[PDB]
Design a protein around this ligand. Sequence first.
Ligand code: A1LYZ
Ligand code: A1LYZ
Lengths: 306, 306
Amino acid sequence: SGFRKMAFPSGKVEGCMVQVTCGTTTLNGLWLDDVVYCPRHVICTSEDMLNPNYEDLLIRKSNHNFLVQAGNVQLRVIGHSMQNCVLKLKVDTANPKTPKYKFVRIQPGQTFSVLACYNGSPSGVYQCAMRPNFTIKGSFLNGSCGSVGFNIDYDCVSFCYMHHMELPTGVHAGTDLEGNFYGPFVDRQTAQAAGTDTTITVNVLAWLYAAVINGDRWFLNRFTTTLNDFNLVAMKYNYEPLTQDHVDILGPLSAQTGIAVLDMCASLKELLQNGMNGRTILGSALLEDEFTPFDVVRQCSGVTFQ
Amino acid sequence: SGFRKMAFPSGKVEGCMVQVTCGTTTLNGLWLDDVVYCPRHVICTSEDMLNPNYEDLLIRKSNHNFLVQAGNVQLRVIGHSMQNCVLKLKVDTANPKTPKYKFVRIQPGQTFSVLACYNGSPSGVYQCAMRPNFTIKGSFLNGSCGSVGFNIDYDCVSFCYMHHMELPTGVHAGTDLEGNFYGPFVDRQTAQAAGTDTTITVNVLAWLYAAVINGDRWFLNRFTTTLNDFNLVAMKYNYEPLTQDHVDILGPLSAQTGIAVLDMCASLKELLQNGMNGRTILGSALLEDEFTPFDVVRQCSGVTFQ
Ligand SMILES: COc1ccc(COC(=O)N[C@@H](CC(C)C)C(=O)N[C@H](C=O)C[C@@H]2CCNC2=O)cc1
Ligand SMILES: COc1ccc(COC(=O)N[C@@H](CC(C)C)C(=O)N[C@H](C=O)C[C@@H]2CCNC2=O)cc1
């Protein structure tokens, strides 16, 4: 029993983090086989960052302009290239700790574990979701760039996020590991802002299922609803539409608890319309939307990873 | 910017987790140097667990009754002993991955990271606090016993918790790594219950400081209060007393934000008396009490560990 915000164990990723320095700019890199991946703005200066031309900036660099440190060992850079917004540094040494891994570009609503690092060294781990507006609500300070987000599918580390910047609202933006930003953002110091966000409906429902699995039942009711009337209520409260694909995805939790998805939707409708009336669900006084259906199954059924 | 529930990176602990089997009972163990530590109820059966006599049960066992698996490798047990509620198994192989480490017994209110494991394999990591009633609000299923809680001080893993059982309210109880329970609990299947809990005041204040550091200021006011009148309010709302040691501990956050501890106490008094009036603090509609002052400093100042 119990239900907590739970990250994947981070050891496999810890073995890959390095420090990358160029000029007076230091940030983190991901060392996999004989390549180090990092944010390309490491090659910038204060003058460049306002409106940099990265192809120019990279033409003017040489392998010796890049200092890469794995622990104390210095790694020697034998080549460099740019792929979208990530720099790839070929080094003379393959990381002996390289896990089995994949690069994946995730959809809004999916969660992942973030290993926050500074100067190549891990500071901590936490869970995040990709918001519908393609920001994440992270915890990042100066020097955090290059920290990565990941899931651990079965045996395989799936990297899905590398950190690049903080927006004026205090939320965060970054790229997949092939250097493409999530959202409309760009890697220069300008006046970009997050669009208005919405609540991830399929995840709120998953978390209500987690609450039932853990003995919280006070929000249940006898009613059901149709997908259409529910989505009308959702639109009114700034919730994402619920699709039939979402209902199918929620299948297994529905089956384990015996509560049909549309019955749980009737509960959610009532919670949106009347509030909680001073009660809590899984220790929360607000509806939580950063657990996916898979996260709930994983934690309530005890899946392990090696 | 940002503030998240943040666990320590778990790699150093992942390298120490093994599986221990005795009879048909399997749980997890902690392999450090040439000793494996695990809950002694692994030597029990359904008949024993109601009121076991562990000295008897252990006299009747032999080294070959204990199967220890590190990954796939089987470790050979060359000795066994009991220390309080933990079993210590001497094995023929020193763990080459043994980190620098200490065993510490923590005080109520202190937090730690839990690496939940099943069959010797890590499932996930999360943050917990030792509640004033010496339970933790964890996430644990059958087979979780032996999972450990830890902090990473500087270079050193400080183990402070090993998991043994779940109480009827769905909360959790366990021991320090020398096998002494936190709280009045015992390792047999009987009718034990958690006492009534209280809220960890020094931690709520630390989290209000985190909110200020991150731009949440709407709860501040011009007033101050005395320790005595505050503690009167605290008692009325089931909050722990605030000591002068707590005020001193909160020193650094007071200094970084310029808000005196007793001014922040006046804010907390008003929040207790009037509620939040539909607003949130760091994304929460309730006052959070599982961040210590050190946790706030660690996350808002970017301390790293190697
Ligand atoms: C210090 O306060 C702040 C400092 C800067 C900002 C907004 O500006 C940027 O975040 N620019 C990019 C760099 C550009 C070229 C993409 C950056 O600087 N990323 C950092 C990579 O290390 C991560 C930032 C650093 C601070 N918190 C973050 O997430 C907001 C607060
Ligand atoms: C299955 O439901 C439940 C199964 C059992 C209970 C209460 O009983 C115990 O937790 N007894 C101790 C064993 C005794 C001898 C200390 C145990 O069984 N610990 C487990 C060590 O692996 C951890 C438990 C297992 C379930 N969740 C936990 O935290 C509650 C729910």
